[PDB]
Amino acid sequence: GDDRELAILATAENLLEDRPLADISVDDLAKGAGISRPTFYFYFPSKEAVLLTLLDRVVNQADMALQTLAENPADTDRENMWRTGINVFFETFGSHKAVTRAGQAARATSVEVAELWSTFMQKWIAYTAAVIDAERDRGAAPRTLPAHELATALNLMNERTLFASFAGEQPSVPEARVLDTLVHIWVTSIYGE
Amino acid sequence: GDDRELAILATAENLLEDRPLADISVDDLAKGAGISRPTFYFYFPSKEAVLLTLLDRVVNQADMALQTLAENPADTDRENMWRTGINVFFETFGSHKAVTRAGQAARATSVEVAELWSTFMQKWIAYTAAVIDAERDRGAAPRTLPAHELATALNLMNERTLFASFAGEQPSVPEARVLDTLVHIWVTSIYGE
Numbered sequence: 001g002d003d004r005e006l007a008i009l010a011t012a013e014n015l016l017e018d019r020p021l022a023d024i025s026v027d028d029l030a031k032g033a034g035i036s037r038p039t040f041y042f043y044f045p046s047k048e049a050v051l052l053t054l055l056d057r058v059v060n061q062a063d064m065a066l067q068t069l070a071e072n073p074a075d076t077d078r079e080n081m082w083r084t085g086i087n088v089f090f091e092t093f094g095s096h097k098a099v100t101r102a103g104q105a106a107r108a109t110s111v112e113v114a115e116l117w118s119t120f121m122q123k124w125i126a127y128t129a130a131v132i133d134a135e136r137d138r139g140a141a142p143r144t145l146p147a148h149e150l151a152t153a154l155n156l157m158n159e160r161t162l163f164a165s166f167a168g169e170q171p172s173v174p175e176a177r178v179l180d181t182l183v184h185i186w187v188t189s190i191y192g193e
Numbered sequence: 194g195d196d197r198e199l200a201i202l203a204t205a206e207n208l209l210e211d212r213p214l215a216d217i218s219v220d221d222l223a224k225g226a227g228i229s230r231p232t233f234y235f236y237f238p239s240k241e242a243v244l245l246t247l248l249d250r251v252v253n254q255a256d257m258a259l260q261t262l263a264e265n266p267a268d269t270d271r272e273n274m275w276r277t278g279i280n281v282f283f284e285t286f287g288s289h290k291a292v293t294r295a296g297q298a299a300r301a302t303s304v305e306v307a308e309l310w311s312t313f314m315q316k317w318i319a320y321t322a323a324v325i326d327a328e329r330d331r332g333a334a335p336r337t338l339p340a341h342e343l344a345t346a347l348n349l350m351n352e353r354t355l356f357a358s359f360a361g362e363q364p365s366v367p368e369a370r371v372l373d374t375l376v377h378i379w380v381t382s383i384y385g386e
C-alpha cells in the first residue's frame with residue numbers, strides 16, 4: 001500500500017546519490033521499487049513530485065527537531081544553546097545530502113520546491129529573531145541591528161555555507177569545521193557590540 | 194569592429210532585465226545589435242558565451258575596485274574600512290542585477306560560469322583572511338577561528354545575502370538595510386571574543 005510509496009522514495013533517494021534527477025528516469029524508479037511504470041504514476045505524477053516529497057520530509061524532520069529543542073531547553077550556556085540548534089540543520093541535512101543537493105537545484109525550476117523552502121526559512125528566521133528578542137529583553141544581548149534582519153542574514157549564511165560544505169564546493173568550510181564556524185559568527189554577532 | 198561586440202553585450206544585458214536567458218534567442222541579440230544571425234556567430238559561439246562575457250566584466254569590475262581600495266587605505270576606523278570594501282560588491286553587482294541573477298542561474302549548467310565564480314571567490318576569501326591575519330598580528334583582532342575558515346563563511350554569507358536582496362527573494366534583508374547588516378556581522382565576528 002503505502003509500502004510501494006516508500007519503495008519509490010527510497011529508490012529515488014538512493015539513485016540521487018549517484019546522478020542528478022535529470023539522469024534518473026521514471027523507469028529507473030519503478031524498477032527500483034519493483035513496480036511497473038504505469039503503477040508508478042498512480043503514486044506520483046512525475047519524478048519531480050517524488051523529489052518534492054523527499055524534500056518535504058527532510059525539511060519537516062529538521063523543523064520538528066528544532067520544535068523539540070524549543071520546548072525542552074537544554075541546561076547549558078548560551079553558546080551551547082545556539083550550537084545545539086544549528087546542529088539540527090547540520091545533522092538533518094547532512095544525513096540527506098543527495099536530497100539536499102537535488103532540492104536546491106529544483107528551486108530554480110519548481111515553484112513548489114521554492115515555496116516549500118521559502119516557507120520554512122521564513123519560519124526559522126522568525127524563531128531565530130524571537131530568541132534574539134528574548135535575549136535582549138532579559139539584558140543578555142545588546143540592542144544592535146533589528147533582530148529580524150540579523151536573523152535573516154545568519155540563517156542565509158547557514159543555508160549557503162552548510163550547502164557548500166555538503167557539496168564539497170570550492171570554496172567551502174571543511175564539513176568537520178563548519179558547525180564551529182557558524183556558531184562563532186552567530187554568537188559574536190548576536191551578543192557583540 | 195569591437196563596436197558590434199559591445200552592441201551584442203549591451204543588448205544581452207538589456208534583454209536580461211525582462212526575461213531569462215532561456216527566453217532570449219540569438220535572433221533577439223542580433224536584431225538588437227543590428228546585425229544578422231550569422232554575423233552574430235562570428236563574435237560569439239552562443240548566447241551562453243555572451244552571458245559569460247557579461248559576467249566576467251562585472252566580476253572583474255568588482256575585483257579591480259577592491260584592488261584599488263587595497264592599494265589606497267581610506268583614513269578611517271576599522272568598521273568603515275570593512276564597510277567600504279563590502280560596499281564594492283553591493284554597488285558593483287547591485288548596478289548589474291540582471292547579469293548577477295543570470296550568472297547565478299548559469300552556475301548550475303556552465304562549467305565556465307562556475308569556475309569563474311569559484312576563482313574570484315577564492316581570491317576574495319584569501320584577501321579577507323590576510324586582512325584578518327594582519328589585524329591579529331597588530332593586536333587589533335583576537336585569535337579565534339582560523340582566519341581562512343572565518344573569511345570563507347563571511348564571504349559566502351555576503352554572496353547569498355546580497356543575491357537575495359537584489360532578487361527580492363522571500364526571505365531577504367531589504368536592499369536598503371543589507372550593507373549595514375553584513376558589516377555588523379563581519380565586524381562583530383572578526384573583532385569579537
Ligand SMILES: Cc1ccc2sc(CO)cc2c1
Pocket residue numbers: 069070081082083084085086089124127128131158
Ligand atoms: C539554526 C538555528 C535556527 C534557530 C535557532 S533557535 C536556537 C536556540 O534554541 C538555535 C537556533 C539555530
Ligand SMILES: Cc1ccc2sc(CO)cc2c1
Pocket residue numbers: 086089090093100121124154155156158159162163
Ligand atoms: C539555519 C539554517 C536554515 C536553513 C538551512 S538550509 C541548510 C542546508 O540546505 C542549512 C540551513 C540552516
Ligand SMILES: Cc1ccc2sc(CO)cc2c1
Pocket residue numbers: 262263274275276277278279282317320321324351
Ligand atoms: C567583501 C569584502 C571582501 C574583502 C575585503 S577586505 C576589506 C578591508 O579593506 C573589506 C573587504 C570586504
Ligand SMILES: Cc1ccc2sc(CO)cc2c1
Pocket residue numbers: 279282283286293314317347348349351352355356
Ligand atoms: C564578499 C562577497 C563575495 C562574493 C559576492 S557575490 C555577490 C552577489 O552575487 C556579493 C558578494 C560578496
